[PDB]
Amino acid sequence: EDKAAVERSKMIEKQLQKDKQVYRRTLRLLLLGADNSGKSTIVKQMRITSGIFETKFQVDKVNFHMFDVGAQRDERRKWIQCFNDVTAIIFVVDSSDNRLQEALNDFKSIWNNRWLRTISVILFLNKQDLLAEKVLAGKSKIEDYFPEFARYTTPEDATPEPGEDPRVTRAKYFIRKEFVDISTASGDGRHICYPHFTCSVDTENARRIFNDCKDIILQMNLREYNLV
Amino acid sequence: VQLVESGGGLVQPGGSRKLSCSASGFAFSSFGMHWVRQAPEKGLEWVAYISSGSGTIYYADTVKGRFTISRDDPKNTLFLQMTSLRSEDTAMYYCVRSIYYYGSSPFDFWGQGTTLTVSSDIVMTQATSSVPVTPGESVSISCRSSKSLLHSNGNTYLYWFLQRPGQSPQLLIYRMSNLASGVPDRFSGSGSGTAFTLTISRLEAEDVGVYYCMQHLEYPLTFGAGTKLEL
Amino acid sequence: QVQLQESGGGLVQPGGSLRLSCAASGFTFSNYKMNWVRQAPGKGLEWVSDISQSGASISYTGSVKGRFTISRDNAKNTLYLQMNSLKPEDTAVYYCARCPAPFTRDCFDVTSTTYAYRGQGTQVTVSS
Amino acid sequence: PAPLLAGVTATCVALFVVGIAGNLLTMLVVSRFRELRTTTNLYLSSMAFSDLLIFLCMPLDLVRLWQYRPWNFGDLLCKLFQFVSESCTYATVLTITALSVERYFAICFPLRAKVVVTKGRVKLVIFVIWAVAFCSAGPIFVLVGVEHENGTDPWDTNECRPTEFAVRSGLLTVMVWVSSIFFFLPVFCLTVLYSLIGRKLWRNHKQTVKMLAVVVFAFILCWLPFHVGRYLFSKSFEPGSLEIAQISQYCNLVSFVLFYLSAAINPILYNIMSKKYRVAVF
Amino acid sequence: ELDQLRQEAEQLKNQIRDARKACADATLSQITNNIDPVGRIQMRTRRTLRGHLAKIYAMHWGTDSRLLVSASQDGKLIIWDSYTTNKVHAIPLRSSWVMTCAYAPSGNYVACGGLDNICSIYNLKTREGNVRVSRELAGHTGYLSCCRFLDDNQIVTSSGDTTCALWDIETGQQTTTFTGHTGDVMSLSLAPDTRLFVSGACDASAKLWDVREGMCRQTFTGHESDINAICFFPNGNAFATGSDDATCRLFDLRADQELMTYSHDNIICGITSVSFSKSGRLLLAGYDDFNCNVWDALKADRAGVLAGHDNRVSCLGVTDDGMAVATGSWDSFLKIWN
Amino acid sequence: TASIAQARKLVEQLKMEANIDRIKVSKAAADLMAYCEAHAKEDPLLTPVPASENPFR
C-alpha cells in the first residue's frame, strides 16, 4: 500500500532531520597548499590511493572536518568547485623567500573564483622559524625576488613578538601585505582573509582556526539574520 | 534472514501467553512484521501489523482490543500479547516480514511458527479446494474477490502463497505480475481485476502444497480458503 | 581546436631585447585572459605575467617586474611579450597559456601535468 | 480639534496604506522563496501576520475617534476583536524580545547558536509566544464592555469602554502592572542584548550598530507612551482636575499614532538593511 | 626523431582538418531552415524533491522511468519516487563528497563516485536489508566524475586522471583502461546499443571509445573550453557537448566534425549538464546562471527556459520514455518538469 | 625516454584516427531530421501529454 511507502518516507524524513542537525552543527574545512607547504605537519598537530583525506578534531564542544586533497591531480580547477559548502579554506604557504609566487598565484585563483567568492580563506604561513633564520642569515636576496620589499617599511601599527628581529617582522608584514592586497583587490567584502603565523610545532593552531571559524560564522549570521 | 518464534503450547481460555518473534541477520528496524494465523484444516488469516519504527498499527476485526502487538527494534524481537484465548484463537501463528516500495516483495519470508492451543471486508472464494494434478502438466489456480483490486495508480494488490506440508508459506507472485525472489520463473499470474488466475508451466514433486490468495488493497488482509494439489 | 603557436626567441646576448608572439586560433581571443609561463632547466613551471581581456588589468611577477611588458591585439588574435634587460637567470622555455573558462580572473596555468590550453612554446637562451 | 482630527486621519490612512503593502510583501516573500526561510525570516513573517491582523481592525478602531457616534456591532464582537488586537500586540512585543535573544545568541556565542538553530525549536518558541500572548490577552473579555451613562438613550450613547467593575475593584492593579511587565522586561532585554551585541561587534559594524541603536530608540519612543497613557487613564478614574484627563487623552492619541507608525515600520526597518532580502525581492 | 615527430603530427593534423573540411557540404542550419520550429514551450515544476542536505551534483534515471537516484555531497544517495515523491532508500555514503551516481538498467545496483577515487557499488534487491556495500572499485588515481552502467556486471568510470576505465563488478578489477585523453575527463555517456561511448575531458576534445576493442576511434576538438557534460543523441550516432565557453556543440560520428553550435550573446556562463529528449529536438543544457535553457537541436533556437532553481543546475536527466525531466541543482532540491 | 615514447604513441593514435571513413554532413543532417520525424509524436516533452493519461498528474 502507498500509505506504508509514505510512512517509510516519513521515517526517512526523521532520519534526515536527525543527522542534518549534526551536519549543520559541524563545520567543514578545506586544506590547501603546495608540496613544500607544511600541510602534512598541520594535520598531525590536530588531536581529539584515496584522493581525499578526512581529519576529525573537536575544540570547545564543536567538531571540525578538514579535507586534504593532496593525493589528487594538480589540475584542480574542477574538483575545487565541490567545496562551496565548506565554511573556510585553510591555505598553507611556504615562507622560503621560490614557491612564494606560486602561493600568491594560487591565493589569487581561489579568491577570484566565482564559486569560491563567498568563502573566507584562512592563511597559515607555516615554517616561520625557517623564514626567520633564512632572513637572519642575510644570504637570501629577498629584494631580488620582490622589488617592492626594497621600498616597503614596517608600519608603525605593527605588533612584533618579543625577541623577534626587526627584519624578520618586516619580511613577515611584507608577505602579509602581499596577500592582503590580493585579498582586497576585489573589494566585494563577502569573504575575508585571515593571515596568521604558525610553525611545525604549534599547539595553538586549533585555537586560531576556532577563532577564524567563529568570526566567519558571525559574519554569516550578520548576512542571514538581518544584521549586516 | 531467519525468523524464529518462542512461546506457546496449551493455555487456558482465560490465561495469558507472551508470543515473541526474534529477528536475526536482517535489519529489524526497516522491515514491518505481520501476524498470520493458520487454524487446523482451514486457511490463513491476518492478525496484526506494525509499520516500520513502531509506527502505524493495525488489527484484524476479530482481534481488535483483545490482542495487542508491540515492536522493539534494539533487541530485534517482535512481541504479541495474548490476553484471552477463545475457541477460534488456536491456530498456527506465523511471523511475516514486509517492506513496501516499488520493486519490494513483502510477505516473502515467513517464520516457522509455534503451536498455540486452548483447553465490507474483502473475502476470497476459490474454484475448488483440491485439484488432483499429475507432475509435469500445467496447473491453473483461480480465485475471486468481492470487488476489483485494481487501484487507480495502475497495479493490483494480489499476493500468491505456496505452503508445503510442514513448511512455512512461501510467496510465489506479488502484485499478480512480479515473481518473488528465488522462485522459479515457471509460475505466472493474470487477472482482469475481479477474477484472478495463477498458471504454472510445469509442476514437480517439490512444488506440491496449498495455494493461498491475498489482497493488500484494504485492511484486513483476508486469505483464501486454500487450494491443495494432489499427485 | 585551440592552437597556441608560439613564435620568436632564439639565442640572444644578455641585456638585449627579445619579443615573443603567439598565433591564437580556434577560439575568441578577446574573451579569455592570457598569460605566460616559463620552464627552466632543473626548475618547475612558474607564472610570468598575465593580461586581462581588454588589457586594463596587467600584472607581472617580481622577478621580471618592470623589465618585461605584455600586450594583446584582439583584432588579429595575437599576444605579445617584449623583453628588456635580460639576465643569465632568465634562460628557459616559455609557454603561452590561456585560462580555461571565459569571463573569469582565475589562474590555473601553473600546473605542469600536461596542461591542455598551452602551446609547445619556444626556447630562449641567454649567454655571453 | 478639526485640524488635529484631519492630520491624525491622514497619518492613519497613510500608515495603513504603506503597512498593508509592507506586511503583504513580508508575508508572501518568505512563503514563496525557500532559499531565505530562516529563523529571522520566520519571525518577520509572524510580525507581518500580526501587523496585518492589527490593521484589519482599523475600520472599527478609527470610528471610535473619527466619529464616535455610530455603534452597530455587539458587545461580544467588540470583546473578540479587542482581544485579538491585544494578543497581536503582545505577540509582536514578545517577538521583538525573541529576535533580540536570538541575535544575542548568534553574536555572543555564534557556534553555540548553531546547535539550536533547528526549525523545531523555532516552531516551539513561536507557538509558546503566541499562546502566552493569548493568555495575557485573556482578561480583556472581562475588562472591556459596552456601557453607557445612566438615564440616557441606550442606542446612541452606547460605547465600548472598560467596565466600571474593573475600576471599582482591584483589577486596576492588573491593568497597570500585568501590562507593564510586558513593557519593562522587553525594553531592558532589548537594550542589554543590543548593547552587548554592539560591544562585541566594535570591541561596516558601525552602520549596523547605529541601526540597532535606532531600532531600540524607535521601540522605546513607540512603546513608552503606549503604557504611560494607560497609566494616566487608570489614574484618571480617581477624582482630580481635568488637566490630567486632557493630558491622558493627548498621550493616548500620541501612543496610538506612534504604535501604528511602528507597526508600519516593522516590515521596513527590519528589511531595508538586509542585503539578502533586498536582493531576493527582485 | 623528435623534429620529424612533431612534423608528422602536424602533417596528420592538417590532413585530418582538410578531410573534415572537404567532408562538409551544407551546415545543419542551412538544411534545416525549412523545418517547422518548435516555438515557445512552457513546462511547469510537477514535483519538487525536498530532503537533501548539501548541494546536489549528479542524478540518473532508471529504465522504469519514474525512479531516480540523486547524489549530494552531504554523504547520501537517495532514490526518489518521481510519481509519488516518497523516498525509496536513503543510502549513507562512506565519503561525503560525491561527483557522480549511476542507476543500473536492471535496477538491482546503484553506483556513485567522487574525490575518494573509488566507485562505490550498492545493491537494492538484497534480502539482507535496505542497502549494502557490494565492493569498492579502488584503483583510480583521479577523482571520479561520471559513471554509467552497461550491464549488471560491467561499469565504466571516468576519473580525473585522464583515464577512462571499464570495471567488472564480479572481479572488481579494471577490465580495460583508456588513456587517450589529455585533460580531466568530466563526463561519459553510453549509446543505447552499449557498443560505443564518448567521454568529455577538460581539453575541449570529445573522444569515442570502444567498450570491446578499447581503441579510440574519433576525437572531436571543436570546442574552446573544458567540456563538463556529454551525452548521446537517442539514435546512438550523434552527441552534444556542454563546456564552460557558454556554447553547446553537436557532433556526429559520421561527419567527424561539429554540425551545429548553440550559443547566445546573453549567455556568459558555462554548461555543466546536458541531455536530449527522446525525439532529440529538445536539447536540455544546464547553465551556470541558475536556470536550464531548452535548445532546439535542429534549429539552435531558445525554445524555453527552466528558471525554477536558485543555484547552479549541476545535473540534468531525462526519462527513458521522455515523460518528464528531473533537474537537480545546488539548492538541495530536484525539480521535475513536464 | 618517456617523452619520445609519448610522442610516438600520440602520432600513432593520430594516424590511426586519420584512416577512418567519413560521411558528408548533408547525409548526417538528413539522418538526424529523419530520426526527428520518426519520433516526433512519441516525445511527451515535444508534444504535451494530457493530464488524464499522464502518469505524473
Numbering used by the authors:
A (entry chain A): 15 to 62, 204 to 252, 264 to 394
B (entry chain E): 2 to 120, 136 to 247
C (entry chain N): 1 to 128
D (entry chain R): 39 to 241, 257 to 335
E (entry chain B): 3 to 340
F (entry chain G): 6 to 62
Copy out sentences from the published article reporting this entry, exactly as the authors wrote them:
The scFv16 was additionally added to assemble the GHRP-6–ghrelin receptor–Gq–scFv16 complex. The complex structures of the Gq-coupled ghrelin receptor bound to ghrelin and GHRP-6 were determined by cryo-EM to the resolutions of 2.9 Å and 3.2 Å, respectively. Conversely, GHRP-6 adopts an upside-down binding mode relative to ghrelin, with its C-terminus inserting into the helix bundle and its N-terminus facing the extracellular vestibule. Additionally, GHRP-6 is largely overlaid with the first six amino acids fragment of ghrelin. Cavity I accommodates Trp4P of GHRP-6 and offers a more extensive hydrophobic environment comprising F2796.51, F3097.39, F3127.42, and Y3137.43, of which F2796.51 and Y3137.43 are closely related to the activity of GHRP-6. D-Phe5P occupies cavity II and is highly overlaid with the entire octanoyl group of ghrelin. Besides its hydrophobic contacts with I1784.60, L1814.63, and F2866.58, D-Phe5P forms an extra cation-π interaction with R2836.55 relative to ghrelin. In addition, D-Trp2P forms an edge-to-face packing with Trp4P and establishes a stabilizing intramolecular hydrophobic network with the side-chain of Lys6P. A previous study reported that growth hormone secretagogue metabolites without Lys6P abolished its ghrelin receptor binding capacity. This finding is consistent with our observation that the side-chain of Lys6P points to TM2 and forms a stabilizing salt bridge with D992.60, which is closely related to ghrelin receptor activation (Supplementary 7c). In contrast to ghrelin, replacement of I1784.60 or L1814.63 by alanine demonstrates a more remarkable decreased GHRP-6’s activity than F2866.58.
The pleiotropic functions of ghrelin are mediated through the ghrelin receptor, also known as the growth hormone secretagogue receptor, which was first identified in the pituitary gland and the hypothalamus. As a G protein-coupled receptor (GPCR), the ghrelin receptor couples to Gq protein and modulates diverse physiological processes upon binding to ghrelin and other synthetic agonists. One unique feature of ghrelin is its acylation, primarily with an octanoic acid, which is essential for its binding and activation of the ghrelin receptor, a G protein-coupled receptor. Here we present two cryo-electron microscopy structures of Gq-coupled ghrelin receptor bound to ghrelin and a synthetic agonist, GHRP-6.
